[PDB]
Amino acid sequence: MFEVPITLTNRKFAQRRKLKYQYINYISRRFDRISKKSSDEERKFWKKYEKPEKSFEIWRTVSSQNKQPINKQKMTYHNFKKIEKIPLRKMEIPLLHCTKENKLYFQSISRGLEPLKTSTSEVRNYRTRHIVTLTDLLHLNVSRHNWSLAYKIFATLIRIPGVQIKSLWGIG
């Protein structure tokens, strides 16, 4: 349930985000050439946005000049399936080089259908399996205001290698 302090990575997750952010670069360019009639591939993505670094989300005052008139002309299904088609053409040949469940992912996440499999569950590393165990027992006693026990879990969690700042300072 609770967040874990692991620097966990797998090839199926390194691909499935890269399989996603490779695609998004093409469909972003395609949206602006139809707006013109009217290469890490993820390092290239975040150059469109400013990472907030103070808050989670870049919140912004509103009663100011950051306002806009509402755009009138809206989407339809006929324009959406023709603006995605040419990015869906070029994507299909790297879709057969990637693994089929990464390929099952991008087929599923492009029609809606967010993933229901959370990444810290199938990792099965036996050391992360205790790091997932301890942090769900760490928060559970802090939830239950049991402090001599949640001390003991927290003293044991910081000694297991690979744990982060996340557990460290927050519940001081």
Next chain:
DNA sequence: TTCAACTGCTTTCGCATCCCAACTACTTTTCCTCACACTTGTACTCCA
């Protein structure tokens, strides 16, 4: 018959642009663990 620059000399011992590095990333090195499609009979009756 004079003005104005070129001129060597003050002491006496001893003191005294190129490289490197940081951290976080991404990647390669491979080795190990199984599945996915194909096929002949046999089984349960099928129509003669």
